[PDB]
Design a protein around this ligand. Structure first.
Ligand SMILES: O=C(NCCNC(=O)c1ccc(Cl)s1)c1ccc(-n2ccccc2=O)cc1
Lengths: 52, 234
């Protein structure tokens, strides 16, 4: 299933490279150490409602 | 926007509004980054000179979070034609960078493959704008948002008396009185994934607004992601 399975446990983008899941993130995010979560690099990352 | 609910504080930060010389909104747009706005090509013909305002939710009166930006470079897709409304997309580069804050932030650009298999496969997407609340009414002074289901491509081609090209997709309702409307053009259609909203469409057209047996027609952003990146690097 890989990416077909709950987006491969990826926070955002999911790719299947050599029968293995590979997560990536939109511009302005950094792939976490677990190689799945996406971490914003600034106070106003894309795609996030400004709910302060 | 016909139906739906108001965008509450901080819920539609990527919304941009195109204003003419009279400072009145005639179309929407989506904030892509500090220097770029995504919009519909057919909107550029709706005004001689216009500016881009961001951070507004109530046009009735300025409060302090709004910001007007002059357009430096207008980039329309060279394949757009008023005859078919195909390639209804354009990107604007601003002269000064947008300052992100409450109600001012960009929507994410997704990757083509993942977006098509995962985002446009979701049940719904969100469309927003200061457009009419009814087909023959006045434009809304309040920014509105509407959750719209993705519509079967075959079902929509059937209902449309206008060709639905590969660069368009359909969303909305068959009978329910909820749809985008006049004045919402160029605005954002975003899809939510794990609390992160990605740009998936541009408000393009529709036979009337919320009419029974008719759906809203949007430009398929995933078919122009390369074009978008190219238009943003120059
Ligand atoms: O302004 C039109 N509709 C009335 C207003 N409602 C909206 O704008 C909406 C916009 C977006 C959604 Cl979503 S609902 C219109 C424009 C162009 C076309 N059209 C299509 C193909 C080719 C030639 C053409 O004229 C038909 C109707």
């Amino acid at each position: 299933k890989l990416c077909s399975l709950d987006n491969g446990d990826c926070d955002q983008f999911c790719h299947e490279e050599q029968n293995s899941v590979v997560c990536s993130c939109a511009r302005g995010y950094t792939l976490a150490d677990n190689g799945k979560a996406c971490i914003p690099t600034g106070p106003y990352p894309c795609g996030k409602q400004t709910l302060e | 926007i016909v139906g739906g609910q108001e965008c509450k504080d901080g819920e539609c930060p990527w919304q941009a509004l195109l204003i003419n010389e009279e400072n009145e909104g005639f179309c929407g747009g989506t904030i892509l980054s500090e220097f770029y706005i995504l919009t519909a090509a057919h909107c550029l013909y709706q005004a001689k000179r216009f500016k881009v305002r961001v951070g507004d939710r109530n046009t009735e009166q300025e409060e302090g979070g709004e910001a007007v930006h002059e357009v430096e470079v207008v980039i329309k897709h060279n394949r757009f034609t008023k005859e078919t409304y195909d390639f209804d997309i354009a990107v604007l580069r601003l002269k000064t960078p947008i300052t992100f804050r409450m109600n001012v932030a960009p929507a994410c650009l997704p990757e083509r493959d993942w977006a098509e298999s995962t985002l446009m496969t979701q049940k719904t997407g969100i469309v927003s704008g200061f457009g009419r609340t009814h087909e023959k009414g006045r434009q809304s002074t309040r920014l509105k948002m509407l959750e719209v289901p993705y519509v079967d491509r075959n079902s929509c081609k059937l209902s449309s008396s206008f060709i639905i090209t590969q660069n368009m997709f359909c969303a909305g309702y068959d009978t329910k009185q909820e749809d985008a409307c006049q004045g919402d053009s160029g605005g954002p259609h975003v899809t939510r994934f794990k609390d992160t909203y990605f740009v998936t469409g541009i408000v393009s057209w529709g036979e009337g607004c919320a009419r029974k047996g008719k759906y809203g027609i949007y430009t398929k952003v995933t078919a122009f992601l390369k074009w978008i990146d190219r238009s943003m690097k120059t």
